[PDB]
C-alpha cells in the first residue's frame, strides 16, 4: 500500500486531532533536540511500543492502593497508585492501563496545584463488585513515578515504576482501600496553578517511554516535530484559542488519524530507514514539506528553530512520495 492517503487535507486543517490530548491540531511544534514517544504511537510495521489503542475512552485499572494524608478524611487529597506492569486486562501491554498518560508525575500537596500535570476526571471504585466510592470523585493528576506512595517522584522509564493518580482538589471524603480500582476518562487537561497558559505540554523531558522505544533525533537540517492542539487548563477552564490569559498548547507525536491508519495496515514495504514519506503542505503564500519516518515520526526542514508553525492558513496537502532524509525537507514559509 501507499501511505499517501494517511495525511489528507482535513487532518491538519480542523478535523485531525493529536494522539495524546485529542485536540484539534492547529500547529506544528518542532523539537530541535529530539524526543521519544510510544503511547498511542504506531510505526510503519503495524506496531506500538506503548500501552494504548488509537481511541480515547476510559482509563481503567482494577488493582491499586488508595489512601489519604493528614488526620482528617474530609476535603482531603486522595492518592491512588499501582505498579507498572500490572495492567493484566490490557492486551497491548501490561505496563499501564489503556489510555494512561505517558507523562512523569508532578508532585504536589495541600492547596498547591501541580504545574503541567495531566489531569482527568473520575475516582476510586471497589474491585470486588465494581461499586464506586462516590465520595472520591474529583480531578486527578495521572503520571508515572518512583517512590510511591511515600514520596512519588517523576520518572520517564516504565520498568519498575508506578502509575499514580492523585486528586488536585479535595475529595468529599477520603478512603484507605487496598486493591482499589481507578476510573478516569481518557480525555485530559493540563493542570495550572492560575489562569496563565504555560509552555507546550508535555515537554520532551516529561514523556514516559517503554523499553525499546526508538527516539526521534535530527537528521541534518531535518528536525522531528510534534503536533500542537489547544488543550484546556484547570487554572482557566474557559480559555480556548487566542485567550487573553494566553493560549495553552498541548502536543502529540502523531495526528490520531495517522495513528489509526498505521495500526490497521502494514506499510513495511513503503519505506526503508533513511527515507521520509513526504507530503507537500500548501499554504496561502508559500509551502513546506512534511516527512514521515518508519518509526512513525514527522520531520520538517526547520533546523535549530523552535518557533511554532501556525496552520490556520493551510490550504491543501498533496502527497509526494519517498525521499531520502539526506535531502533537507523544503521549507518556504
Amino acid at each position, epitope marked *: 500500500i501507499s501511505p499517501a492517503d494517511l495525511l489528507t487535507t482535513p487532518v491538519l486543517t480542523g478535523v485531525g486531532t493529536d494522539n495524546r490530548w485529542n485536540g484539534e491540531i492547529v500547529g506544528l511544534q518542532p523539537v530541535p533536540g529530539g524526543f521519544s514517544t510510544c503511547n498511542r504511537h504506531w510505526n510503519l510495521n503495524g506496531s506500538t511500543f506503548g500501552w494504548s489503542s488509537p481511541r480515547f475512552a476510559a482509563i481503567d485499572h482494577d*488493582r491499586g*492502593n*488508595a*489512601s*489519604y*494524608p*493528614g*488526620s482528617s478524611s474530609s476535603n482531603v*487529597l486522595e492518592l491512588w497508585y499501582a*505498579s507498572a506492569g*500490572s495492567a493484566a486486562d490490557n492486551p497491548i501491554s501490561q505496563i499501564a492501563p489503556d489510555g494512561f498518560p505517558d507523562m512523569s508525575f508532578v*508532585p*504536589f*500537596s*495541600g492547596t498547591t496545584v501541580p504545574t503541567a500535570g495531566w489531569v482527568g476526571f473520575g475516582g476510586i471504585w471497589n474491585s470486588s463488585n465494581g461499586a464506586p466510592f462516590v465520595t472520591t470523585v474529583q480531578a486527578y493528576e495521572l503520571g508515572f*513515578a*518512583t*517512590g*510511591a*506512595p*511515600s*514520596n512519588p*517522584q517523576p*520518572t520517564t522509564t516504565t*520498568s*519498575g*515504576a*508506578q502509575i499514580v493518580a492523585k486528586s488536585i482538589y479535595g475529595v468529599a471524603t477520603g478512603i*484507605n*482501600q*487496598a*486493591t*482499589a480500582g481507578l476510573f478516569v476518562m481518557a480525555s485530559g487537561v493540563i493542570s495550572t496553578p492560575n489562569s496563565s497558559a504555560i509552555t507546550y505540554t508535555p515537554q520532551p523531558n516529561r514523556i514516559v517511554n517503554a523499553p525499546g522505544t526508538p527516539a526521534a533525533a535530527p537528521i541534518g537540517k531535518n528536525t522531528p516535530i510534534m503536533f500542537a492542539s489547544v488543550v484546556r487548563r484547570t487554572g482557566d477552564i474557559n480559555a480556548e484559542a487566542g485567550s487573553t490569559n494566553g493560549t495553552q498548547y498541548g502536543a502529540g507525536s502523531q495526528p490520531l488519524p495517522v495513528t489509526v491508519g498505521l495500526s490497521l495496515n502494514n506499510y513495511s514495504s513503503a519505506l526503508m530507514p533513511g527515507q521520509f514519506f513526504v507530503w507537500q503542505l500548501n499554504f496561502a503564500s508559500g509551502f513546506m514539506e512534511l516527512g514521515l519516518s518508519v518509526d512513525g515520526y514527522f520531520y520538517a526542514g526547520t533546523g535549530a528553530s523552535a518557533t511554532l508553525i501556525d496552520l490556520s492558513e493551510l490550504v491543501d496537502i498533496r502527497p509526494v512520495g519517498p525521499r531520502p532524509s539526506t535531502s533537507t525537507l523544503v521549507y518556504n514559509l
Partner: antibody, heavy 122, light 108 residues
Framework: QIQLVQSGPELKKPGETVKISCKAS????????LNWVRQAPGKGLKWMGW????????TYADDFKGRFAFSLETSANTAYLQINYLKDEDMATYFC???????????????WGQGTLVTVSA | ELVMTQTPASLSVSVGETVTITCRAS??????LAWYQQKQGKSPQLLVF???NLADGVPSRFSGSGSGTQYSLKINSLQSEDFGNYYC?????????FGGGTKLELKR
C-alpha cells in the same frame, strides 16, 4: 555513606510531650520518603506512617492520627516525630527508615536509623 | 486490614542446617512482601523485597518465595551470623503490617 542518625534517648512522664530527630546524610533528602516504625521492648514492629520529604505531606496509620505528628526541616536534612499526651502504651523504640520503590528495587524499607527509646514513667 | 501471621514463633537451629520460616497474609498482597532481620539491640536490616529478591549485599544462602497469601523465607546452611529475629512485612494498602516475628536461637 548513607545513614539515618536519630536523636538520643528521652525519659518523660505521662502527659508530657516528646520530639524525636532523625537526620539523613549521604543522599538527597527530599527525593526519598521517610517512614516511622515503632517497637515496644520485646514486642514486634508496628508501622506508623510516612512523611513525604518533597512536599512535607504526612500520612498516618489510623491508630496514630490523634497525638502523633510528622514534620521536617529541609535545610537541616532532618525529619521530626512529635508525640503529645504520652501514654504508657507509647513506651517504645522509634525508627525512621527510608522508603524505596523503583528501578528494580522495592517496595522496601532500605535504611534504618539506630532507633530512639522513649521511656515513659512517673 | 491485611494482618500478617508468621510461623513458627521460634526454633532452635544449628550451623549448617537449612531453615524455612513462613509468613501468611489474611488476603492477597500480590508479592508486595519484604523480609527483615533484626539482631538483639540493633535496628532491622532488609533481606528480601517483592517476596523473591535479595536486597543489595545479602548472601546467596537466603531465599524468598511465595505468591498470593502464603510466603516463605529459606536460609540454606545457617551460618553463625544468621541468628536473631526475622520479620515479614506487606506493602499492600495502609496500614502496612509486620508479622509477629520468628526468633532463630542456637541449638545445643
Amino acid at each position: 555513606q548513607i545513614q539515618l542518625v536519630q536523636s538520643g534517648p528521652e525519659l518523660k512522664k505521662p502527659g508530657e510531650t516528646v520530639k524525636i530527630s532523625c537526620k539523613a546524610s549521604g543522599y538527597t533528602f527530599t527525593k526519598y520518603g521517610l517512614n516511622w516504625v515503632r517497637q515496644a521492648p520485646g514486642k514486634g514492629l508496628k508501622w506508623m506512617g510516612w512523611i513525604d520529604t518533597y512536599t512535607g505531606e504526612p500520612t498516618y496509620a489510623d491508630d496514630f492520627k490523634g497525638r502523633f505528628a510528622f514534620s521536617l526541616e529541609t535545610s537541616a536534612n532532618t525529619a521530626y516525630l512529635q508525640i503529645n499526651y504520652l501514654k504508657d502504651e507509647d513506651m517504645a523504640t522509634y525508627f525512621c527508615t527510608r522508603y524505596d520503590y523503583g528501578e528494580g528495587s522495592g517496595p522496601q524499607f532500605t535504611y534504618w536509623g539506630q532507633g530512639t527509646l522513649v521511656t515513659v514513667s512517673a | 486490614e491485611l494482618v500478617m501471621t508468621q510461623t513458627p514463633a521460634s526454633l532452635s537451629v544449628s550451623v549448617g542446617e537449612t531453615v524455612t520460616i513462613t509468613c501468611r497474609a489474611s488476603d492477597n498482597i500480590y508479592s508486595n512482601l519484604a523480609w527483615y532481620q533484626q539482631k538483639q539491640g540493633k535496628s532491622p536490616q532488609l533481606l528480601v523485597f517483592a517476596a523473591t529478591n535479595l536486597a543489595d549485599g545479602v548472601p546467596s544462602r537466603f531465599s524468598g518465595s511465595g505468591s498470593g497469601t502464603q510466603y516463605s523465607l529459606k536460609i540454606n546452611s545457617l551460618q553463625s551470623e544468621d541468628f536473631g529475629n526475622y520479620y515479614c512485612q506487606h506493602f499492600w494498602g495502609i496500614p502496612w503490617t509486620f508479622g509477629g516475628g520468628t526468633k532463630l536461637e542456637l541449638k545445643r
